[PDB]
């Protein structure tokens, strides 16, 4: 199996390092607009390979024939109605290099706004919708589960957590389908300190460009890189990722943050969880600002941006 | 660090790979009475060492020197009023030959019956509560969790559950506590179907007996290896154990199935889940229980036996 | 991809699960003649999946229609002319069970003699040479660099041999070409302590016999699943391998134990190391041995044995 | 354990995140001089460990406090005369601020040039030299063997080699201690290409500075966390790093690169390998080059640079 990462800096490269330290790909391709970057990249994965041990072979190139006949593509390439415009074409130009060569892949969007970015994806591929979806809701459990294990200094490996809708303000938190040991995290953290936690992970990628003055890429990249590993697997992940609903949840042609099973299909299933009146108002208006941004695309389209 | 593992037999033996393979510890030590059994175990796995790629030293011995300054011990060694009686001079016994040479140890107990072996052990330690506990929620749960993996056909990594009490017909199950990628599983199976993987879970080591004529090894050796591994790491841990309860859902001066923290203290903490009246009334017959065969060994050392 | 392993006793269980933990197959199947034995060690071995956690399927039967379109399959059914015979029919007819719905695999034997009952199921395949092989040399260099490592002590990951040949007293070993961090282990060992290492690992597997009274398990079902990861991975392992050897060492139309190049065609390319007078003298002499045995193999069958 | 990595750029954090994801030390701290990056850095590794599953606390800090009493300590930070100069100034002071609040620690450093910073942090640590060492045979021989197995499209797992002296032009390839599947690569590979595969590993560096403009991290990070690990587990790796020599290969009063024997004493042993007419005359060399540096050191000190 063929893994592509379409963009190489920070979060491509720790897609692609840590989908080729998972041994399970027999490659693994950057491709990148910057010459020499890449290329350098791979090189140094490559020389890293038997230290750390692992025999996938990176590549790095800055054209669409060495990702050809690709089974999972990883799409982090990308920087209001600016950025839409500009994502959207960077995200849908990369999108239709890939596939022609590529024809059976799958394909994980990372770029955003993120639930609008698998849309102009899954339009420029001619895929089903099973075979696009987005990395959101991994990156956002990821931090909320973090921030639970440090609350209660528990291990991470005991803390489950679902998240879904949006990225930010739009992002609907779940704390009574967050468990630690099986135990739902209400009966062991008051309202108050989790509700501090929920505000925490809404604003968690701004946090830390706060603090660096760049965003983060080790835990976006480990997210999607979980997502490649159970395509490449099959082995039927339940994760929250940007997806395709039809009548589920009661959204409509719509991709947004949901728990799916992910497997050799894709998306395989999209689960319903059973929501609340709060929860349900809650995605009702994740689901209304995902409207929002397709109208916005459409507007750009017509005046020529 | 340094474990040592009582019994080596097909339970013992098994933890004591599965901690080897982890490579954390510097030295594992099988300890057991048959002559070369033993030996020849642990030399099997030491010409493993190379091909699995473990550096922990896998000892052999019919004596207990080797065992000395061990930081963890795992007791397996174990065969109604017979089997209590002979495996309360096995446990017992062996409990007083190794803390001799190991008053820092924390220890973890397979035998049956596991809650009042628990017991048995802890009081022949001279160890505090918090250094004795036993193996049977892990194993428990790892059973229900398979079969809810199963029947939903999903990755085994998404599912959590939450088991309590002793094992088999006093088990309680907590399928309310049990969830799928974050979602509770009474919201993904039914109640009949729950009840049946309840039921087989309850029966699951008679079920393997029944098939193959001798009780299993490689999930009850898999489960006290976790609990190994997380006193060693420091991990802090969420899982069911047979701990000392005192004043934790209502129960005194007694040792059961319950959810706790594990670290280097041992039992670090008693985790206090909400209970509804049915459960309390599960848990309270499984305590019920646990008392009578209390009651009963008191009354064989009364009787010589 | 879909592992059989016939023979669900000490080391077949070993080999399914050591690749069932692996996570690389999405099953693998033990298939053995004693009713419920590789049932109930695929129902233990499920059950251990969510503690490990490993996806991989391990199915347990008695028949072959669930060993359909396996991509790989070990064989470890199996027990001097007594010997020969009653393996040459176990091995040969469960190859023949084997192969009629698997008829894309490749197969690894773990059967004594082993150089001669691989070529026994390469005949009852109809199989190209390529796709059989017989697991030794990996379990008898495990076993010389734990002999290794441990007078050094140094780490096992540090140390690499060659051996050829066949098992015992016709196995080549080759010190010069052993190594710690890379360098030759006769710099580090002098010659008396280095023969006295040759001479145990030519003699461990009795010695594991005569110590606890069967043969051993854990390092020769490593050995056989780390080969099975090979294929699978098409990780291009070089290994010393029960190969079909055509010109390679002077020796021709026999499979006997040489270095080889594993991957997805199963054996690659047989490796030719340089060998001294002595080291071809041995080397003719343990190819005169299995000729020896594949001889009286004629005779067991010309007198209806 | 505790492990602290001075440095939070592309090395740095490459070398906290490696040793985090090993799940081996309790805590690894990054400190750095400029504000926010190591926090943010830290924050998102934190964020990213339970998707990778590791309970190693991350964190990150301009200050020296919360490095006290760690176990090992990794100096990355760093930028002829002139950086001589410059990386003295830096590697010392950091390596003062650092010892005073972790006395019993061993130190790995990761500045060039290298071999000379290795004895600057030597002498500003007041350890005795068993417990300071330099990293750069360990990605030397990293990158060989990554070329090695490239070339014959083999495994990385089953190559080895050793490598000596100090980086780049002065750098002593061993081809005869090379080996693949334990036999030696001059019998599998020609004398032409060895060479340019040597030369490649000497200029290897540089090659990518030349492809992305920057230097490399992932393969460094890599070598410096194996480091780490061989002392925190004490599992006596052989590996070539910069090392205090008394006496071995005739060198004296130097470090320089050596194959070693490294654990919980740091380098607990030199090894000798034998070393040919040429390669005693390149190794001469290379010495040469160190102490040409180490007089360039003194003249900058009284020259009050």
Known sequence: ??????????????????????????????????????????????????????????????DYGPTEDSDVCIITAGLRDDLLAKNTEIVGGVTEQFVEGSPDSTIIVVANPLDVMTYV???????????????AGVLDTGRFRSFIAEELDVSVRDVQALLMGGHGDTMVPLPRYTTVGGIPVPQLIDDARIEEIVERTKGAGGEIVDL?????????????????????????????????????????????????????????????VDLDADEKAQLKTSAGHVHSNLDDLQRLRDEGK
């Open 121 to 135: 994806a899954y339009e420029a591929s001619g895929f089903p919708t099973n075979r696009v979806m987005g990395m």
């Open 1 to 62: 199996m063929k893994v592509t990462v379409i963009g190489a800096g920070n979060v491509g490269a720790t897609v692609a390092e840590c989908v080729a330290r998972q041994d399970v790909a027999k490659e693994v391709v950057m491709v990148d607009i910057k010459d020499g970057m890449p290329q350098g990249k791979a090189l140094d994965m490559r020389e890293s390979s038997p230290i750390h041990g692992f025999d996938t072979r990176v590549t790095g190139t800055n």
């Open 212 to 272: 660096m003055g760049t965003s983060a890429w080790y835990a976006p990249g480990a997210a999607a890189a979980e997502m490649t590993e159970a395509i490449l697997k099959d082995n039927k992940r339940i994760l929250p990722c940007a997806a395709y609903c039809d009548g589920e949840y009661g959204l409509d042609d719509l991709f947004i943050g949901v728990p799916v099973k992910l497997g050799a299909g894709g998306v395989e299933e999209v689960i319903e």
